Every structure is written in C-alpha cells, then in structure tokens.
Amino acid sequence: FHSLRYFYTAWSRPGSGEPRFVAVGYVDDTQFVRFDSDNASPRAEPRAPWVEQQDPQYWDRNTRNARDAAQTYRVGLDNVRGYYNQSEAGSHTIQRMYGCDVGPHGRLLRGYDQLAYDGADYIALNEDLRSWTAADLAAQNTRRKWEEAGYAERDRAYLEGECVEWLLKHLENGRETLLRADPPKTHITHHPISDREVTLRCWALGFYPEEITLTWQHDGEDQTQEMELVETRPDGNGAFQKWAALVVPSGEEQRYTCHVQHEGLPQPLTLRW
C-alpha cells in the first residue's frame, strides 16, 4: 500500500575533485529528504513541508549517517574499480536502492536492498533477507565480504524494524500530502495538420499518485499501436502529467473516445471531441 524508498548515487570525477555522493528519500511518489556531498559541510535537508517538523535530532542523526555513507562509497568506488581492473582515468558509478513496502496491516510486505555499478546490477539482497545475489565474478568479491561480516542480518533488522516504523511516522506526519489521491484534470485538444487530417491529444494533468492509464478507442476498438503515449512527467508542484495523441481524419473526430483510469476517479472517464 505504501513504501519508503532511498536512492544513493556515487560517482567519481577523475581530475575534477573527489567523488560525489547524492542521496534522496521518498515516501511513495513524494520526495522528502536530500543529501549532497558537494555542499560545504553537507547536511541532510528536508524536501517536503511535512517532514520539516521532525525533531532536530532526526536531521543531526541522518546527516552523520549520510556523511558516513558518502565516505564509504568513495572508498567503495576504488574497491570496485580494482576488482574489474579498470583505469583510474575513467568515471564510474555506484547506485543503491533500498526500502520497504508496507501493507494495510502496518507490517512488512517486502524489503529490498540492491546495488548497481555503471548502470547494471552488481549485488542484491535476496527476498529471504539472509543471502546475496552477485551479478558477476567481481561482485562475488563483495558477496564473500558481506557474508563474513554478516551484513544481511543488519539489513533484515532495519527493513523489518526501523524502515516500517519510519514509513508509518512519515505517513502520519504527511497524511494530507501522502494520503491523497488527486484525480487528473482531463481535456482534449485539437490541432489541424491539413484539410484531411488532425491531431487529437488527450491530457491528464495535476494527478497524484503517478500510476495512470490513458487510452484512445476508435468506435470501441483500442488504438494503442496508432497512438503516441508520452512518459509520465512531474509538473514541478508535486504532481504528474501525461498525454496520449492520435492522428485522425478531419471529419471523424466524433468516432474517437479517450479513456482515463486513475485512483482518484470514482469511475473511469470517457472524453470525446
């Protein structure tokens, strides 16, 4: 039902200073925290109005955690570059994605902790939260070390412990922002190309959460292969946008309907020009 998700990115910049580390945290589709190692005296900073009221010890605690994670991945970038025997003159990236999905009962549905190196799976915590899956031979180096250190158990304790409890605190402190389901504002626009052909575009604006279905029908027959559907985009204000467009003969606009499914809609919408 809800999820707390953290995204780490660390990459080297050969010749342009130390590596950089950026971390962001999200509750569902809403960002609430950031950390940027390129700041002088970098701090974990709020990125949501609702999370601001969190005790000052939360921000001091997570600042020291983030600074330590940044230092760890700076050394980690050299460790992994060495496993692959890559040149020091090349830039490389370590990413980490971890968090927890919680269900209605307030209990863990699934936890996860995955790392990538240069945009490809490197090592991932397995679904039993006790063992690691390494993607290639170099990642076995990491895997052996993480088993002997027992890090999977620390992940399990966090994912089944703090992660769930912190997702629930954030959900309550940001209930008005996070527990909404804003339907899309929908309309159709009409752009003549010639005397015989026109473009119909079906808009969905200002909706939250990100999940949505947009489809064109021609007398009831789906038009997915004929339509252009853009990727869902943020509007900049905490919500999302999407549209689907279709080229249609200049006298046939009335034979086409757009259909919109979204969580905030009591029923699916049907629009026509």
């Binding site: 955690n65 991945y73 490197y122 993480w146 620390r154 994912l159």
Partner: peptide, 8 residues
C-alpha cells in the same frame, strides 16, 4: 532514518 551502508 537512512539504513547502514556497507562497503563494497
């Protein structure tokens, strides 16, 4: 809270 971070 962030989780603990493990050295690769």
């Amino acid at each position: 809270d962030f989780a603990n971070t493990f050295l690769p």
